[PDB]
Design a protein around this ligand. Structure first.
Ligand SMILES: *[C@@H]1O[C@H](CO)[C@@H](O[C@@H]2O[C@H](CO)[C@@H](O[C@H]3O[C@H](CO)[C@@H](O)[C@H](O)[C@@H]3O)[C@H](O)[C@H]2NC(C)=O)[C@H](O)[C@H]1NC(C)=O
Ligand SMILES: *[C@@H]1O[C@H](CO)[C@@H](O[C@@H]2O[C@H](CO)[C@@H](O)[C@H](O)[C@H]2NC(C)=O)[C@H](O)[C@H]1NC(C)=O
Ligand SMILES: Nc1ncnc2c1ncn2[C@@H]1O[C@H](COP(=O)(O)OP(=O)(O)O)[C@@H](O)[C@H]1O
Ligand SMILES: [Mn+2]
Ligand SMILES: [Mn+2]
Ligand code: NI
Length: 419
């Protein structure tokens, strides 16, 4: 079957997820050690965030949604892992009151309204964990992977960013939790395949059709469950076009930043929004995240616009098109690091230590993913891929230093002398 059962309901893979060969380059490691061993990282980390305050203290707790919303910080989506794990557990277990077709993106997704009237975003499982994207597919043709959303949230935490949105795996009874709880116009898009599996078409721009319907085996269906963002009226948001947006066309397949190595110097460092602040440092952080997971679909950034007079940060969202290929690294994604050559000091240290201990990043990710009820979240073949991609990032960091000085790269805030 193209759409298999949730792996958690299948035979348990007992194989060693780390019986693969990886040995980090020691030359690169030591060279990255000398130019930074005397840098006062402690002083730097304290400048990466101007003012660290939450929404509750700014606006001057019945459930885990409300405590999450209140604890949304000005330099982070969340701190305190234990309450998020409580929110995750709640997202997995809370009874569903309503299911509605979600208004927004292009691929199939529902908004869950729980009994307590709180909400979440649902993205249905389609293919298995082992599935790799068609090599002929562009970034805009890939069907989203629910398990990538889960995997990235955990990885975003492991990297200490905590700017992704809490997401948990969940296996639904399509009859009781989806169909019977679905709005009428969604309800009518349900049907049975010739194999007597339960299926729904839903309605959306991207292949919500009979041919590409989501189907259970026969009646269960795993999906990613992501806590809804706080209301737009209460916590408004900004939608910003990325300067490293891809072309999204098959004819002209090469954007300027893909062909021009001076793109960062000439086209973004000189822009109003990026010349001063944290935005560019955010962009480097997110493309490091996108490169590790192979996410090519970063066309826009989403940010809260609620902490007045404080710099906003990009919310690490939309990771459905990540983890599509385990045997391919898209060096184009990490281009902003190579072109801009600035890097948040905490990120460097965080990136460090992980590299200095081979397999530690992927090990630190796996146990984190394991606590998700839908584990295994990622096929193990993606683990060596992430270690390799990490190594390239380190090499690319080394390149940034000698060309554009080491004291010019590691900054807690970015300022362009010419704006
Ligand atoms: C901005 O303020 C945030 C809130 O204080 C902040 O939070 C704290 O961050 C640390 C980072 O790990 C958390 O840490 C540790 O201690 C708990 C307590 O047992 C352990 O369970 C963890 O494993 C970890 O060792 C704190 O929990 C967290 N404080 C809370 C409760 O929110 C940010 O660090 C501040 N600035 C930044 C960098 O965004
Ligand atoms: C979804 O829910 C239904 C029940 O609501 C499941 O099944 C029942 O299984 C018993 C076993 O004795 C049968 O006798 C009943 O006929 C079933 N009930 C009905 C009315 O369907 C089903 O297994 C559930 N699927 C999952 C995976 O959640
Ligand atoms: N967890 C969420 N809560 C509320 N709104 C969301 C959430 N995730 C995404 N959105 C909104 O939905 C829009 C598209 O969702 P997205 O995840 O991009 O779906 P797709 O990848 O299919 O386009 C985004 O512009 C965002 O504003
Ligand atoms: Mn999107
Ligand atoms: Mn997407
Ligand atoms: Ni098709």
């Amino acid at each position: 079957p193209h759409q298999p059962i949730p792996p958690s309901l299948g035979e348990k893979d007992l194989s060693d997820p780390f019986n693969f060969l990886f040995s980090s380059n020691k030359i690169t490691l030591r060279k990255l050690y000398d130019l930074t061993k005397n840098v006062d990282f402690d002083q730097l980390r304290q400048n990466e965030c101007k003012k660290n305050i939450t929404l509750s203290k700014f606006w001057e707790e019945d459930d885990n949604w409300e405590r999450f919303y209140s604890n949304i910080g000005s330099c982070s989506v969340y701190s305190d892992d234990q309450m998020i794990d409580n929110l995750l557990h709640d997202l997995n277990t809370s009874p569903i009151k309503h299911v509605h077709i979600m208004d927004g993106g292009t691929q199939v997704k529902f908004v869950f309204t729980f009994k307590n009237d709180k909400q979440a975003v649902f993205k249905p499982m389609r293919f298995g964990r082992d599935y790799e994207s068609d090599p002929n597919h562009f970034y805009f043709s890939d069907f989203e992977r629910h398990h990538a959303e889960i995997a990235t949230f955990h990885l975003d935490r492991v990297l200490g960013f905590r700017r992704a949105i809490p997401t948990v795996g969940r296996v639904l009874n399509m009859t009781t939790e989806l169909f019977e709880k679905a709005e009428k116009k969604l309800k009518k898009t349900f049907f049975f395949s010739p194999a007597k599996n339960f299926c729904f078409v839903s309605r959306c721009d991207y292949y919500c059709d009979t041919t590409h319907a989501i189907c259970g085996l026969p009646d269960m269906k795993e999906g990613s469950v992501q806590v809804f963002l706080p209301d737009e009226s209460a916590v408004p948001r900004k939608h910003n076009r990325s300067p490293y947006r891809r072309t999204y066309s098959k004819k002209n397949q090469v954007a300027e930043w893909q062909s021009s190595m001076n793109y960062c110097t000439d086209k973004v460092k000189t822009k109003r929004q990026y010349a001063h602040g944290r935005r560019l440092l955010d962009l480097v952080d997110i493309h490091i995240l996108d490169y590790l997971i192979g996410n090519q679909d970063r066309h826009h950034f989403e940010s809260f616009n609620v902490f007045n007079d404080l710099p906003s940060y990009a919310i690490h969202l939309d990771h459905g098109r990540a983890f599509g290929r385990s045997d391919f690294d898209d060096d184009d994604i990490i281009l902003p690091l190579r072109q801009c050559c600035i890097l948040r000091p905490s990120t460097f240290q965080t990136l460090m230590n992980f590299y200095s201990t081979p397999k530690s990043l992927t090990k630190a990710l796996h146990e984190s993913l394991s606590k998700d009820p839908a584990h295994p979240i990622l096929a193990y073949k993606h683990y060596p891929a992430m270690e390799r991609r990490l190594a390239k990032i380190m090499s690319h960091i080394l390149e940034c230093f000698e060309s554009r000085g080491v004291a010019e790269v590691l900054v807690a805030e970015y300022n362009n002398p010419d704006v």
